């Protein structure tokens, strides 16, 4: 029991749930998608110099 309870600590950031979040990260790839669209908007911007 002392092992089990103190095995709980996680100390540093560990993986039980932290492991779950990894699959989620891809969502930012969608966030990056917009950032590219912002650059596409620069086409509209400099198009106005042309």
């Amino acid at each position: 029991s002392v092992y089990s309870e103190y095995q709980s600590k996680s100390g540093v950031n560990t993986n039980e749930e932290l492991a779950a979040l990894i699959q989620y990260q891809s969502s930012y790839g969608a966030a990056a998608k917009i950032v590219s669209t912002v650059d596409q908007m620069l086409d509209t911007l400099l198009g106005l110099k042309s």
């Binding site: 993986n15 039980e16 492991a19 779950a20 699959q23």
Partner: protein, 50 residues
């Protein structure tokens, strides 16, 4: 005289097998159930890091 000594000597030390058999039957099933519980752990193994 030796008869009484030998009888009581035996009466003191030796055990019945049937009583143990009941327990022996009893434990083997529980120990059997233990495996099935462990086999269940195989399915439990899917979640930890998802």
């Amino acid at each position: 005289l030796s008869v009484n000594v030998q009888s009581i000597k035996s009466n003191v030390i030796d055990v019945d097998y049937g009583e143990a058999m009941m327990n022996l039957m009893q434990v083997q099933l529980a120990y059997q159930a233990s495996l099935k519980a462990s086999t269940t752990i195989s399915q439990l193994s899917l979640l930890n890091y998802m």
